[PDB]
């Protein structure tokens, strides 16, 4: 509710030149009243008259109806930033010491220097890649300061800190002015030409951090990073974080030389400009009390919000007898028992998987009588099959003749790594084998990433120690020979076994299409990179193989991407490092009570997670939309809050206000309301109370809820014609002809949409759908009242059960200690009372008998299993090649719809003995209600249920008719 009113301040703040609220309602009489109020408001404003009398004349509308959005009639230029910023440009601009970056262009020079001419310029090295503007951030920041310019006591101190810092940003930006952003939210050459190239990204990071400060320490930290980052753009993040690995070993629940290693980390930080942050760690080392460890964590998390190290592709590419090691035997075990049908029909499975396949070059295509630039690997199969070009038995050579294009992955505080771009023959020849490999991993604890439904908590608990950072080793030219030799050595079935082998052989000698300016060079490449199916799976096999080789009783051994550990000091560490050295491999072999790795660090016997997800600077420009960009931003914010870092929620609200609004005219924007924004739908961006999900309980919410589903999926005048060409029909039929026998169409209908659901990706479709959606969306807010609802959802089901639950105050004592100290108090309180789980809740039906039987190579989603299970015994399909399971399919479907596995709920033990407070759906509804109350009150409530026997049958029918709501942004799933 505070969001809707806050938005008013923001609009009044930006505009000084009318605001015409818009109210809707399920009530029919009120609705006409809403229309009268609305109509009169325009007239009054377009006539320069008051509106105070009208509001009094519509108290019923304000008090009893729902706000749908707030129109804004403006007539300035949105250049209020230039004017507002000056008040804060009092400080002295920063001057970047262009003598800090080993790589010239990494230095914050003047754009006109790095790129003398326009045809030479490329924001490819600093692009925020986010669909929001720098001016907006500046505007948003100014709004908060105006609002909190009079706060008192401690609140004021936050302002003084925020005020100070922001000045650094305002002062520097002011010197060069505030850069103007184009429709594509990019930053052209003319605007950039006379300004410090790395200005825009820097401002975003500085703004993101300064709007994340609260305590004094946050300020010094935001302040030191903000300043050094302006000139240092290649080691600040690495330097600030680096010592965290040694620190974990320090606290109870170390050899002299280890201490020196830490001193050097501190010195390097010091010799690099740092002052206060190094001092803080120094103070911490006097007692090394886990009680004061939270600070060390804020530093490691904060170092990430400095931005993304985006260097030139070639530079990134450039960094790249005793090999017992090439154990990599592991391959055989994973594929020993399996004439598995999967291995025999590997070609169909890989073909089907394409939806979850990597990416290839944006080839040229023709379907029917047109041309397109699709980059999706699946479509390539369509063009090739309908062109006699499709030839999987012949996997394209990846060498000098036909080199490998290149993709990339950027991450704060680490040298850029490259990603191959192999054709589709490679994915197809790798899906079945990898998939079979994973099943073995799935039940092998050594692979801490795959094992069962295991969550990071299980991994944490396992650690009766020695940890490593084999990230560089996975790309060490030395590694490729062994790695490939082992996979090949281990290697319908023979056809598949052989083809996979060839992928390795073509790779053994792989050339890279590495760009080098507006030109595409072409150098060699004797290192291994990612881009193959087997990448993540095979990489682990190698990493596990490596530690076994290196390893004066092995209690546990584990792998996890770029880290491998084992619980079995100065002598052992030396012996370990020298051993790693002998194999000529760059690695961080440490030894300790604690361990640190890329995904989680265990300092003090407590589990910690890094919290540095850049919010105002994205890694790459995907295909998401401005709206989805916001829902994604809010997702990111929640994950951070949960992990540690916390950007002020008011700021986030401001961004959502900027990011969601849409203009119908050149002087009229339409800011969607809080009800429109948070109501559970395909456009839901956030929650009206972090960590708590609501569901239509009032008539209005449901009235609007059914109304929104309507314009949820709007056809694409491209995604249909594509299925109209012989290509699509041949591809679908061709795939099916080797998958079906009887009348499969239930299966057949799904496959088509399986493609029609990703096809939008193609710009002309995503853009066509996105632009068209605006016309429908704008009109949608206008006038509805005409919908033939009949479909039911969780909202409708839950609304039914509510009245039958009797709530009464109950009490729950805190008994479980803390192990994830960063969790916000309200979240931490639930774990303290009911505990937490170290497992994921089956939300796909994968663990049902019918599914196991179907596992034919086909794989029906939870939705399909749900629809199929709801069928008559006669109809129940097993057309594929092959029970009262009916309960389990529904359970997985329901849990999926409640995101019980994502968000903060994934950290709650929903089967906690303590969560007695309740007296399948009635129960889960009972549990969610109690948990949510706990989060929003700190106290517990006990629920009683006297659901009549008659009501249960009506409800039972509803259960098998629930539809979904797509929005993927909501994605909070972090561990």
């Amino acid at each position: 509710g505070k969001y809707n009113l806050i938005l008013s301040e923001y609009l009044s703040f930006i505009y000084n030149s009318v605001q015409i609220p818009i109210y809707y309602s399920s009530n029919s009489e009120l609705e006409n009243r809403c229309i009268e109020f609305h109509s009169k408001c325009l007239e009054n404003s377009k006539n320069g008259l008051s509106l105070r009398k009208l509001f009094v004349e519509y108290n019923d509308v304000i008090e009893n109806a729902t706000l749908l959005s707030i129109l804004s009639y403006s007539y300035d230029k949105y250049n209020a930033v230039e004017r507002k910023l000056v008040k804060y440009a009092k400080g002295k601009p920063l001057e970047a010491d262009l003598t800090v970056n080993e790589l010239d262009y990494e230095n914050n020079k003047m754009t006109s220097e790095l790129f003398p001419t326009a045809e030479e310029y490329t924001d490819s090295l600093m692009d925020p890649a986010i669909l929001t503007s720098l001016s907006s951030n500046l505007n948003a920041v100014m709004f908060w300061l105006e609002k909190h310019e009079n706060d008192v006591a401690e609140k004021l101190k936050v302002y003084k800190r925020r005020l100070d810092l922001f000045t650094i940003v305002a002062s520097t930006i002011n010197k060069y002015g505030v850069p103007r952003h184009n429709a594509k939210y990019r930053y052209e050459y003319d605007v950039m030409k006379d300004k410090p190239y790395y200005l825009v990204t820097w401002a975003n990071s500085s703004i993101e951090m300064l709007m994340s400060v609260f305590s004094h320490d946050d300020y010094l930290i935001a302040k030191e990073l903000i300043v050094l980052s302006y000139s240092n753009r290649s080691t600040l993040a690495k330097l600030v974080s680096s010592p965290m690995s040694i620190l974990v070993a320090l606290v109870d629940i170390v050899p002299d030389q280890t201490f020196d290693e830490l001193n050097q980390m501190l010195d390097n930080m010091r010799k690099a400009g740092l002052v206060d942050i190094p001092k803080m760690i120094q103070d911490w080392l006097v007692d090394r009390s886990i009680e004061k460890f939270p600070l060390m964590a804020k530093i490691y998390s904060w170092s990430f919000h400095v931005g993304f190290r985006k260097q030139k592709m070639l530079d990134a590419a450039l960094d790249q007898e005793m090999y017992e090691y090439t154990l990599i035997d592991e391959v055989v075990k994973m594929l020993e028992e399996p004439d598995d049908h999967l291995l025999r029909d590997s070609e169909l499975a890989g073909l089907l998987s394409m939806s979850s396949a990597s990416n290839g070059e944006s080839r040229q295509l023709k379907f029917g009588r047109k041309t397109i630039f699709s980059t999706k690997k699946n479509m390539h199969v369509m063009d090739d099959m309908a062109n006699e070009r499709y030839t999987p038995g012949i996997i394209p050579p990846v060498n000098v003749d036909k080199p490998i294009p290149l993709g990339r992955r950027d991450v704060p505080g680490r040298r850029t790594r490259i990603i191959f771009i192999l054709p589709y023959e490679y994915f197809i020849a790798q899906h079945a084998v990898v998939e079979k490999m994973l099943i073995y991993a799935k039940h092998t604890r050594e692979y801490a990433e795959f094992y069962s439904q295991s969550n990071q908590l299980l991994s944490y608990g396992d650690v009766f120690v020695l940890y490593t950072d084999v990230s560089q080793w996975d790309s060490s030219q030395h590694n490729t020979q062994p790695f490939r030799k082992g996979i090949i050595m281990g290697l319908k079935v023979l056809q598949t076994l052989n083809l996979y082998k060839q992928t390795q052989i073509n790779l053994m000698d792989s050339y890279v299409q590495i760009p080098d300016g507006n030109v595409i060079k072409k150098i060699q490449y004797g290192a291994v990179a990612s881009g193959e199916k087997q990448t993540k799976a095979a990489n682990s096999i190698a990493n596990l193989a490596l530690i076994k080789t290196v390893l004066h009783a092995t209690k546990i051994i584990r792998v996890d991407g770029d880290d491998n550990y084992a619980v079995l000091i100065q002598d052992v560490s030396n012996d370990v490092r020298e051993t790693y050295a002998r194999m000529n491999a760059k690695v961080k072999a440490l030894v300790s009570v604690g361990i640190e790795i890329a995904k989680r660090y265990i300092a003090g016997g407590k589990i910690f997670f890094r919290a540095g997800i850049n919010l105002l600077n994205n890694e790459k420009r995907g295909q998401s939309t401005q709206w989805d960009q916001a829902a994604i931003l809010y997702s990111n914010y929640i994950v951070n809050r949960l992990r540690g870092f916390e950007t002020d929620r008011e700021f986030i609200l401001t961004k959502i206000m900027q990011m969601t609004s849409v203009a119908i005219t050149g002087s009229l924007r339409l800011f969607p309301s809080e009800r429109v924004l948070t109501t559970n739908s395909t456009f839901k961006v956030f929650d009206s109370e972090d960590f708590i999900i609501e569901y239509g309980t009032t008539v209005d919410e449901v009235y609007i809820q059914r109304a929104f589903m309507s314009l949820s999926s709007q056809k694409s005048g491209i995604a249909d014609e594509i299925a109209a060409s012989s290509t699509f029909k041949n591809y679908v039929t061709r795939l099916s002809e080797q998958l079906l026998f009887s009348k499969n169409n239930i299966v057949s209908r799904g496959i088509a949409l399986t493609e029609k659901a990703k096809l939008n990706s193609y710009a002309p479709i995503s853009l066509e759908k996105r632009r068209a959606q605006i016309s429908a969306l704008l009109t949608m807010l206008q006038k509805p009242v005409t919908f033939k609802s009949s479909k039911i959802t969780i909202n409708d089901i839950l609304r039914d059960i509510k009245p039958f639950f009797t709530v009464s105050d109950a009490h729950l004592p805190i008994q479980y200690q803390k192990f994830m100290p960063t969790l916000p108090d309200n979240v931490q309180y639930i774990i303290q009372c009911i505990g937490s789980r170290t497992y994921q809740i089956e939300d796909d039906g994968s663990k049902s008998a019918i599914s196991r039987l179907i596992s034919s190579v086909y794989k029906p989603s939870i939705e399909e299993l749900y629809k199929v299970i709801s069928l008559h015994e006669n109809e129940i399909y097993l057309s594929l090649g092959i029970y009262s399971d009916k309960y389990r399919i529904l359970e997985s479907y329901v849990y999926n719809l409640l995101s019980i596995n994502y968000g903060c709920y994934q950290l709650f033990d929903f089967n906690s003995p303590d969560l007695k407070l309740i007296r399948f759906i009635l129960h889960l509804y009972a549990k969610l209600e109690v948990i949510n109350y706990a989060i929003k009150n700190g106290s517990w409530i006990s629920l009683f249920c006297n659901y009549p026997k008659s009501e249960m049958i009506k409800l039972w029918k509803k259960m098998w008719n629930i539809t979904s709501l797509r929005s993927p942004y909501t994605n909070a799933n972090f561990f």
Partner: peptide, 28 residues
């Protein structure tokens, strides 16, 4: 967890002493 925060607090005790002896051994 305990069986490894005590193979480090017992390789100090063990050390210092295994050495208090080495000072009784004129071995370069």
């Amino acid at each position: 967890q305990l069986l490894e925060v005590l193979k480090t607090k017992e390789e100090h005790q063990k050390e210092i002493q295994y050495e208090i002896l080495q000072k009784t051994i004129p071995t370069f």
